């Protein structure tokens, strides 16, 4: 007897597509290009890794299933699985050192590597673990993930901070020019204080998994790894070695200039006038007067774009310059229809909030004019 199970296409494709996603294309060592299939009892367990992240998905098997474990090329399996007609039943078994995929009038033969070639995750015990709604953890990542740095160096900037303090879980992300942070409360005890820095590629992956809009995920924070367990999936990620800076000392303190405006009209006007801004720096000029915002941009060809937007503003007069992409990025994640800007002077950072709550906060440094 050998490994043999039977599964609907849609039953298999849902986790296989996710698991295959973390599997890098054409790795040095061949096993790292494969998904690990394990049948134990009536359950199928697909595991993929890139030596930084390990994703595991599980499917119940409705029919009989003789058990076993083997690894098979992830992409080819997924490509095959998706190319099959809707609702058809797939037969998967091992013969010799090959995987035999039959479904309808189609027969596929993939080349396998042994289950013991697959690396095991050397994960120890948690230092703190809790549960939180998938929607809440997804909100923390998505409301701030845009502000992470984009280089690959193993430095705190190229990752998101997850911080547990009081009864609240907080995400923080910054690239040195802008910062995004979001904070919600959860069923964590209050004597708890602990930080982890999840790398950029990993935390963006974790957000992609938190799709059950009404589900719950179990988080475990350790010295070197972080575990997300959703009953359908088990996501594991190495951490960033190093301490995250005192992000609190980056939030601006003395803003006497409140600007309330329409989120969309600002995004559209910033984006519009940027067409004639400088391609490298993408700087625009904000010119605040009483109840008015005058936007200006110009480029080396001495082309120029102005646009006036009516806004709520009863403060002083201020002229300030910003990298328009930083502004559009913040406006991209603002959920409310109105947006609040808190400025001080032309050379100090801007603070952006949503209209009706301060759970998420965004700091954007300006440009010298």
């Amino acid at each position: 007897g050998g490994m043999h199970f039977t599964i609907q296409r849609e039953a298999l494709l849902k986790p296989l597509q996710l698991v295959a996603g973390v599997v890098e294309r054409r790795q040095t060592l061949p096993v790292l290009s494969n998904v690990l299939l394990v049948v134990e009892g009536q359950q199928l367990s697909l595991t993929g890794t890139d030596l930084e992240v390990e994703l595991v998905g599980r499917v119940v098997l409705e029919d009989a299933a003789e058990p076993g474990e083997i690894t098979v090329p992830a992409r080819k399996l997924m490509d095959i699985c998706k190319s099959l007609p809707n609702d058809v039943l797939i037969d998967i078994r091992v013969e010799e050192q090959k995987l035999l995929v039959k479904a309808g009038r189609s027969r596929f033969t993939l080349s396998t590597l042994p289950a013991n070639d697959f690396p095991t995750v050397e994960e120890g015990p948690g230092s703190l673990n809790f549960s939180i709604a998938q929607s809440k953890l997804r909100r923390l990542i998505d409301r701030t993930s845009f502000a992470m740095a984009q280089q690959d160096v193993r430095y705190y900037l190229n990752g998101m901070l997850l911080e547990v303090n009081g009864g609240t879980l907080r995400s923080v992300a910054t690239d040195g020019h802008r910062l995004a942070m979001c904070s919600l409360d959860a069923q964590i005890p209050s004597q708890d204080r602990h930080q982890v820095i999840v790398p950029r590629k990993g935390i963006l992956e974790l957000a992609r998994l938190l799709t059950e809009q009404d589900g719950e995920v179990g988080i475990v924070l350790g010295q070197h790894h972080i575990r997300a367990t959703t009953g359908e999936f088990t996501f594991t990620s190495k951490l960033v070695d190093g301490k995250f800076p005192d992000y609190e000392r980056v939030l601006p303190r003395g803003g006497d200039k409140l600007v309330v405006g329409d989120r969309q009209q600002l995004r559209e006007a910033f984006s519009r006038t940027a067409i004639l801004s400088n391609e490298k720096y993408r700087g625009i000029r904000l010119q605040l007067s009483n109840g008015l915002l005058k936007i200006q941009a110009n480029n080396p060809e001495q082309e120029e774009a102005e646009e006036e937007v009516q806004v709520e503003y009863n403060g002083g007069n201020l002229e300030i310059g910003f990298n328009v992409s930083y502004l559009l990025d913040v406006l991209g994640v603002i959920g409310t229809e109105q947006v609040r800007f808190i400025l001080s002077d032309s050379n100090s950072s801007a603070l952006v909030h949503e209209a009706d709550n301060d759970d998420s906060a965004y700091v954007v440094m300006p440009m010298r004019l």
């Binding site: 900037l157 910054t174 040195g176 020019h177 802008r178 910062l179 800076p245 005192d246 000392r249 980056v250 720096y281 990298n323 050379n347 950072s349 700091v363 440094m365 300006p366 440009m367 010298r368």
Partner: peptide, 10 residues
Amino acid sequence: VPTLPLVPXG
């Protein structure tokens, strides 16, 4: 192009 007051970093 000034940065946020990160220490170190800027």
